Amino acid sequence: MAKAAAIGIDLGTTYSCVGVFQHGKVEIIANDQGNRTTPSYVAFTDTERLIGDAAKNQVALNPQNTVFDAKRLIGRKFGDPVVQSDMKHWPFQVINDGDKPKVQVSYKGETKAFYPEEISSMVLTKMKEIAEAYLGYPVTNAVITVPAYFNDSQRQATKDAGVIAGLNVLRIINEPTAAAIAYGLDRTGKGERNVLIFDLGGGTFDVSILTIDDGIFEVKATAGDTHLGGEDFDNRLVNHFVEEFKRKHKKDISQNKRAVRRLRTACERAKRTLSSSTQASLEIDSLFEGIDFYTSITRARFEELCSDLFRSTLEPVEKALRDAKLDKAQIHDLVLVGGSTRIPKVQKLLQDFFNGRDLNKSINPDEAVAYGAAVQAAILIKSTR
Numbered sequence: 001m002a003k004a005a006a007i008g009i010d011l012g013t014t015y016s017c018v019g020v021f022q023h024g025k026v027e028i029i030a031n032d033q034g035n036r037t038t039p040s041y042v043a044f045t046d047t048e049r050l051i052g053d054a055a056k057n058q059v060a061l062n063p064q065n066t067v068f069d070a071k072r073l074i075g076r077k078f079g080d081p082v083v084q085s086d087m088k089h090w091p092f093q094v095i096n097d098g099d100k101p102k103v104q105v106s107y108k109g110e111t112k113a114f115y116p117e118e119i120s121s122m123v124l125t126k127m128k129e130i131a132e133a134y135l136g137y138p139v140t141n142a143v144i145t146v147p148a149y150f151n152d153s154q155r156q157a158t159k160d161a162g163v164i165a166g167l168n169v170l171r172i173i174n175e176p177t178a179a180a181i182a183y184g185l186d187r188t189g190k191g192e193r194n195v196l197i198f199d200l201g202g203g204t205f206d207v208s209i210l211t212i213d214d215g216i217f218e219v220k221a222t223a224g225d226t227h228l229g230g231e232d233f234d235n236r237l238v239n240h241f242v243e244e245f246k247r248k249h250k251k252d253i254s255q256n257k258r259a260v261r262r263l264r265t266a267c268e269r270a271k272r273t274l275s276s277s278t279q280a281s282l283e284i285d286s287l288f289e290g291i292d293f294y295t296s297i298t299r300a301r302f303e304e305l306c307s308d309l310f311r312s313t314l315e316p317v318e319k320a321l322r323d324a325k326l327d328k329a330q331i332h333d334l335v336l337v338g339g340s341t342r343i344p345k346v347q348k349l350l351q352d353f354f355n356g357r358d359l360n361k362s363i364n365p366d367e368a369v370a371y372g373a374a375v376q377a378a379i380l381i382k383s384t385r
């Protein structure tokens with residue numbers, strides 16, 4: 001029953017996703033708001049702890065006590081220059097507990113501090129409860145994914161987050177490996193198969209090259225930009241619309257925190273529409289000083305606004321190929337991961353770089369990792385019996 005069942009969890013930097021492999025198919029499980037992915041956010045309020053959508057939905061009202069990006073801290077020492085650099089950009093406090101970072105917040109009127117693995121365990125507990133509500137019984141066996149570049153300390157702290165969350169961690173697997181499993185790229189028989197995973201998420205960009213030799217995965221190269229993602233594209237749209245508001249009304253809105261946030265969420269929505277329509281409409285009632293902001297933007301203008309950022313995704317692709325010592329024609333498969341890979345210009349740039357090659361994109365790119373983890377969790381629990 002429950003003991004013969006296992007889930008696959010993609011514990012992402014900005015969003016998490018849970019899947020289950022049963023009756024010959026993967027089911028990506030929708031949360032209680034009907035969303036197939038859940039924000040990796042934890043909010044501490046005057047009455048409760050919120051996780052996911054409810055936590056992301058109140059971030060503007062409570063920024064000091066809304067934790068996100070715990071994955072950037074997990075398994076790291078406080079003195080790590082990655083931690084010291086990131087801390088300057090977060091509205092929540094990060095403290096030092098014997099060279100270990102803790103996020104410090106106000107919860108039910110009291111000061112509380114949490115280890116990154118404790119924050120990530122709250123996200124994991126939510127994914128576990130989302131699976132349980134779908135299945136009708138508690139599932140505790142899980143495969144959790146991590147970036148291919150995570151070291152032993154980061155992998156161990158992720159497993160620790162799983163244990164705190166009440167999960168039996170069957171295995172910690174690499175995100176690009178789970179994506180290759182999702183597409184069945186490890187079941188092509190004999191011979192070395194070279195796979196490139198192009199993973200453009202909400203806040204990070206990862207390029208991974210894997211060799212699959214008779215079911216055995218080997219990481220040949222990892223490249224990317226830990227501070228490049230979908231939110232930089234939302235921000236480029238924001239600056240455009242702030243300048244358009246100034247041209248139409250002779251008013252600078254950039255200082256009004258509420259106006260900028262409402263514009264930001266509307267820009268994120270319009271960006272998604274631009275992946276399947278050649279125009280998107282913004283409809284903001286009373287954006288600033290009672291002025292409605294009803295406008296539109298073409299996909300051509302959005303592509304211009306992010307042109308330099310889209311083009312920059314090809315430098316880590318070339319870097320990974322040189323590190324792996326492979327030419328473009330030596331790569332057998334190209335896999336898309338992350339919601340931002342739905343952007344047509346991004347697909348076109350990658351396909352043209354690989355000389356007109358087909359891309360593996362039929363599985364929802366923001367779900368491909370959880371899909372593969374779910375497949376592996378099923379194989380692993382069946383072998384355990």
Ligand SMILES: Nc1ncnc2c1nc(Cl)n2[C@@H]1O[C@H](CO)[C@@H](O)[C@H]1O
Pocket residue numbers: 015200201202203229230231268271272273275338339340341342343366
């Ligand atoms: N249809 C889409 N077109 C463009 N960007 C998209 C799309 N869907 C998502 Cl999710 N994202 C973005 O992916 C990230 C999460 O993986 C977020 O930045 C989200 O906006």
